[PDB]
Design a protein around this ligand. Structure first.
Ligand code: HEM
Ligand SMILES: CC1(C)O[C@]2(C)CC[C@H]1CC2
Length: 397
């Protein structure tokens, strides 16, 4: 009578609250006894839910390969996800090619440029009264910024989200391939129109790049593009979709942030722990024993962060958002050599998005006449969060 029996991450039961949190809180329980379980979904796999246990997997690079990070494998053809489906040396090497454009320093030069666009997207409907905080804001803030890093066309959110919708998987036959081939099409065009008349963007920074003293093949360039056009548009879009659905009803939290922004940065981390959409797996390359279980090479182990972010033997009162909690050592971004590449970037987007969104519309609420839809998968969160506020005034013209 275990929940691991049929544990499935693209299929987690949703409580009345609308979130699959009722499940986690409960499974979070079972793990105290059995920190790891075997699931019968997807041919057969391992579920790692204990904090001490998931933290033991991400660290032993020996027995676990990242060549199976997305699982079931992500729709990407004969292209491997850079610095993510590759183990070192490839990893250590490939990454140092974008290490700098992502450092806190370099990812600050866009700082007060995100407030503009945020505070400039709040003009879009601050005069209507409502709007899907997901589609309308959750999505555009992370999508526009990216476009700007990969030297891209700002208003095509729709097009990109369409590609990522196929990478991300839509349990569709191969139409994920038909559509991924277009990302590869545009990805190709963009590449070729950069090695001529460049820019300061990242996409460009890597072309001129060279490994071993020799440039790089486009099967690695079209490879990065994917990871990035996928790093900051999905996980983020969802995550934000969440804090907005969370601030729509958690008035105890809304009013508290509204009156103490010194905390917004900190409380942005407690939200990452509680609403982290990120979930990954590893691939077993050699017999190894974790805690009390033994895993033979060939099998995959899913690392259930949402569950290990609620382990009581690591977090005081885990089921409450404690905006003061310090330190916050969750794993919603992972640890080890695979520590999120855009780690500092979302702490920023959040800081702002939320900071500015509350100074503009300090009152709003879950639209009663439209129900919120939650996304599932290795990336989950709110997809549609329609709110209703007091029709206001915009700063724009
Ligand atoms: C809120 C959104 C985000 C979340 C929760 C998230 C989560 C994660 C997680 C869990 C990992 C590590 C997995 C592992 O250890 O194997 C990771 C890796 C990575 N993320 Fe993100 N991410 C987010 C946003 C970003 C952004 C903004 C970018 C895009 C520029 C980015 C780029 C990447 C890349 C390329 C890696 C693989 C390289 C590596 O860590 O070794 N992430 N992220
Ligand atoms: C593919 C997947 C699941 O998505 C992101 C956002 C988090 C972990 C990995 C790499 C980047």
């Amino acid at each position: 009578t275990s929940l691991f029996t049929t544990a499935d991450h693209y299929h987690t039961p949703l409580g009345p609250d609308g979130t699959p949190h009722a499940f986690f809180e409960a499974l979070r329980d079972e793990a105290e006894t059995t920190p790891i379980g075997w699931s019968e979904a997807y041919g057969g796999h391992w579920v790692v839910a204990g904090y001490k246990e998931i933290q033991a997997v991400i660290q032993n690079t020996k027995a676990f390969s990242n060549k199976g990070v997305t699982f079931p494998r992500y729709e990407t053809g004969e292209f491997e996800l850079m610095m993510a489906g590759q183990d070192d040396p490839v990893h250590k090497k490939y990454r140092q090619l974008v290490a700098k454009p992502f450092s806190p320093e370099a990812t600050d030069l866009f700082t007060e440029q995100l407030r503009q666009s945020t505070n400039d997207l709040i003009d879009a409907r601050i005069e209507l009264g409502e709007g899907d905080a997901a589609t309308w804001l959750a999505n555009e803030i992370p999508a526009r910024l990216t476009a700007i890093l990969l030297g891209l066309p700002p208003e095509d959110g729709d097009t990109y989200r369409r590609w990522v919708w196929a990478i991300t998987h839509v349990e569709n036959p191969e139409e994920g391939a038909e559509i991924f081939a277009e990302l590869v099409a545009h990805a190709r065009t963009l590449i070729a129109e950069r090695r001529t008349n460049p820019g300061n963007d990242i996409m460009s920074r890597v072309i001129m790049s060279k490994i071993d003293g020799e440039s790089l093949s486009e099967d690695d360039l079209i490879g990065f593009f994917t990871i990035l056009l996928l790093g900051g548009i999905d996980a983020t879009a969802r995550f934000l979709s969440s804090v907005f659905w969370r601030l729509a009803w958690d008035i105890e939290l809304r009013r508290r942030l509204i009156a103490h922004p010194e905390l917004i940065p900190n409380a942005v981390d407690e939200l990452l722990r509680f609403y982290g959409p990120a979930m990954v797996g590893r691939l077993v390359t050699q017999e190894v024993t974790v805690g009390d279980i033994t895993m033979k090479p060939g099998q995959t182990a899913m690392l259930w962060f949402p569950i290990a972010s609620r382990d009581r033997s690591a977090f005081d009162s885990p089921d409450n958002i404690v905006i003061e909690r310090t330190p916050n050592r969750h794993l919603s971004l992972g640890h080890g050599i695979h520590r999120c590449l855009g780690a500092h970037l979302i702490r920023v987007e959040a800081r702002v998005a939320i900071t500015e969104f509350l100074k503009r519309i300090p009152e709003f609420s879950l639209d009663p006449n439209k129900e919120c839809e939650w996304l599932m998968g290795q990336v989950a969160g709110m997809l549609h969060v329609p709110i209703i506020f007091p029709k206001g005034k915009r700063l724009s013209e």
